[PDB]
Design a protein around this ligand. Structure first.
Ligand SMILES: *[C@@H]1O[C@H](CO)[C@@H](O[C@@H]2O[C@H](CO)[C@@H](O[C@@H]3O[C@H](CO[C@@H]4O[C@H](CO)[C@@H](O)[C@H](O)[C@@H]4O)[C@@H](O)[C@H](O[C@H]4O[C@H](CO)[C@@H](O)[C@H](O)[C@@H]4O)[C@@H]3O)[C@H](O)[C@H]2NC(C)=O)[C@H](O)[C@H]1NC(C)=O
Ligand SMILES: *[C@@H]1O[C@H](CO)[C@@H](O[C@@H]2O[C@H](CO)[C@@H](O[C@@H]3O[C@H](CO[C@@H]4O[C@H](CO)[C@@H](O)[C@H](O)[C@@H]4O)[C@@H](O)[C@H](O[C@H]4O[C@H](CO)[C@@H](O)[C@H](O)[C@@H]4O)[C@@H]3O)[C@H](O)[C@H]2NC(C)=O)[C@H](O)[C@H]1NC(C)=O
Ligand SMILES: Nc1ccn([C@@H]2O[C@H](COP(=O)(O)O)[C@@H](O)[C@H]2O)c(=O)n1
Ligand SMILES: *[C@@H]1O[C@H](CO)[C@@H](O)[C@H](O)[C@H]1NC(C)=O
Ligand SMILES: *[C@@H]1O[C@H](CO)[C@@H](O)[C@H](O)[C@H]1NC(C)=O
Ligand SMILES: *[C@@H]1O[C@H](CO)[C@@H](O)[C@H](O)[C@H]1NC(C)=O
Length: 161
C-alpha cells in the first residue's frame, strides 16, 4: 500500500545524486508514502535531533549540504504526522528502511527517474521505488544501472505475465 522511494548515486546528476557519489553512498531514502497526504498544522514539530535519528538518510537540499533535515521534516509534515500520529514509530520505520537500503540492492527495486548516459549506453537510475511506475528520462531498449548494478528491465523482478 505505502510507496517506498529512494535516491541513488549518479555523478552525472547535479544535487543529492552527485553528493551521494562523492560520499560513497549508494541509496538514500526519500520517503514512505501512504495514500493520505497531510494538510494543515502538524500534530508535532519534527526536531533536528529526532530527524538525525534516521541514520544514513541524506537531505535533497544543497542548503544543508545534503545532510539533514529539510527533506526529513518535509516528509514528516506532508506524509508522516496524519498517518503515523506519533514521531517515534515513524522515525523507527524510516531508520529501519534506510538501514535496509544501506545493505545493498533491495528485494524490490524499480526505476522511477533515469539519466540516459550516452558513453555507457545505460539508463542510470537516479530514483527508485519498491513497486513499478511510469518512467521519467529512461530511454527504451537500454539496460538499467541501479547504483552500479546492471538490470535488463526497469525492475529487479518480473512484473508482467
Ligand atoms: C563527476 O561529474 C562532474 C560534472 O559532470 C565532473 O566534473 C566535470 O569534469 C570536467 C573534467 O575535468 C570539468 O570540465 C572542465 O571544465 C572547465 C570549465 O568549465 C566550466 O568551469 C566551471 C567552473 O567555472 C565548472 O564548474 C563548470 O562545469 C563549467 O562548465 C574547462 O576549462 C575544462 O577544459 C579544460 O580541460 C579539458 C579536459 O582536460 C581540456 O581539453 C580543455 O581544453 C581545457 O584545458 C574542462 O572541460 C567540468 O567543469 C566538471 N563539471 C562540474 C560541474 O564540476 C567530474 O569529472 C565527474 N567525476 C568523475 C568521473 O569522477
Ligand atoms: C503504511 O503506512 C501506514 C500509515 O498510513 C502505517 O500505519 C500506521 O502505523 C503506525 C504504526 O507504526 C500506527 O501508529 C500507531 O497508531 C496508534 C493509534 O491507532 C488508532 O487505530 C487506527 C488504525 O488501526 C488509526 O487509524 C486510528 O486513527 C487510531 O489513532 C497510536 O496509539 C500508536 O502510538 C502508541 O505507540 C507509540 C510508540 O509506537 C507511542 O509513541 C504512543 O504514545 C502510543 O502509546 C502509534 O502511533 C498507525 O495507526 C498506522 N496508521 C494507519 C492510518 O493505519 C503502516 O505501518 C505502513 N506500513 C508499511 C508496511 O510501511
Ligand atoms: N505518491 C507520491 C508522492 C511523491 N512522489 C514524488 O516525490 C516528489 C516529492 O513528492 P513529496 O514532496 O510529496 O515528497 C514528487 O514530485 C514526485 O516526484 C510520487 O511520485 N508519488
Ligand atoms: C528490513 O528487512 C528485513 C529483512 O528483509 C525485514 O524483516 C523488515 O521488514 C525490513 N524493514 C523495513 C522497514 O522495510
Ligand atoms: C537506526 O538504524 C541503525 C542502523 O543503521 C541502528 O542500529 C540504530 O541504532 C537505529 N536508530 C534508532 C533511532 O533506532
Ligand atoms: C555500492 O554499490 C556497488 C554495486 O553493488 C558496490 O560494489 C559497492 O560496494 C557499494 N558501496 C557501498 C558503500 O555499499
Amino acid at each position: 500500500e505505502n510507496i517506498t522511494q529512494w535516491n541513488l548515486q549518479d555523478n552525472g546528476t547535479e544535487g543529492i545524486q552527485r553528493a551521494m557519489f562523492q560520499r560513497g553512498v549508494n541509496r538514500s531514502l526519500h520517503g514512505i508514502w501512504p495514500e493520505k497526504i497531510c494538510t494543515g498544522v502538524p500534530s508535532h514539530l519534527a526536531t533536528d535531533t529526532e530527524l538525525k535519528a534516521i541514520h544514513g538518510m541524506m537531505d535533497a537540499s544543497e542548503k544543508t549540504n545534503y545532510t539533514c533535515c529539510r527533506l526529513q521534516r518535509h516528509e514528516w509534515n506532508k506524509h508522516g504526522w496524519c498517518n503515523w500520529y506519533n514521531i517515534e514509530p515513524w522515525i523507527l520505520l524510516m531508520n529501519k528502511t534506510q538501514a535496509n537500503l544501506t545493505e545493498g540492492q533491495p528485494l524490490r527495486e524499480c526505476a522511477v527517474t533515469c539519466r540516459y548516459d550516452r558513453d555507457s549506453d545505460l539508463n542510470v537510475v537516479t530514483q527508485a521505488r519498491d513497486s513499478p511506475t511510469p518512467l521519467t528520462g529512461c530511454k527504451k531498449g537500454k539496460n538499467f544501472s541501479f547504483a552500479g548494478i546492471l538490470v535488463q528491465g526497469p525492475c529487479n523482478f518480473e512484473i508482467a505475465v
